[PDB]
């Protein structure tokens, strides 16, 4: 229904040996959503995996008006657990 360009950097966090996940949301494209109104796309990013109760599971880009190919260039930083490896997420 479209696509999202992301650049993602796993950091086995050079400051801690936890894992942190930088997610640069670059853009979306080909969004199948030529809507009955003002389209205002934004991109939610969520991390999924174990031990996330204490952590910010969700981010979102700003919205972009009337844009089926919205650029964002917005960089988020999830924390994973320390224990569960990146393959648990």
């Amino acid at each position: 229904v479209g696509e999202v360009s992301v650049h993602v950097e796993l950091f086995t966090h050079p400051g801690t040996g936890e894992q942190k996940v930088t997610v640069k949301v670059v853009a979306a494209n080909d969004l199948k959503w030529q809507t009955s109104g003002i389209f205002r796309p934004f991109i939610e990013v969520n991390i999924v995996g174990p031990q996330l109760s204490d952590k910010k599971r969700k981010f979102a880009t700003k919205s972009k008006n009337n844009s089926w190919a919205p650029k964002y260039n917005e960089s988020f930083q999830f924390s994973l657990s320390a224990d569960a490896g990146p393959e648990c997420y």
Binding site: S5, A27, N29, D30, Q34, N66, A69
Partner: protein
Amino acid sequence: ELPTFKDRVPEYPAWFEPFVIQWLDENEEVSRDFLHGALERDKKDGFQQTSEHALFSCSVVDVFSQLNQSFEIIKKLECPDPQIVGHYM
């Protein structure tokens, strides 16, 4: 970085070239169908200038976005065979 293959233009891109070409084709069709969408939106909107300084209407932005997405994929391949690159280009 092994001497044995720093001594060569890498041969592996020649394996993938037919697939990248097929992808470039698919991408052209997707681009030309996206274009008609982008234009039909803009035309139905009566070609509003994107803003009072973006003197052009939105379909330009859509189209170049599509093209740029398309280009950036190719560019990220960084194909080390300049003849395969010339062919892609």
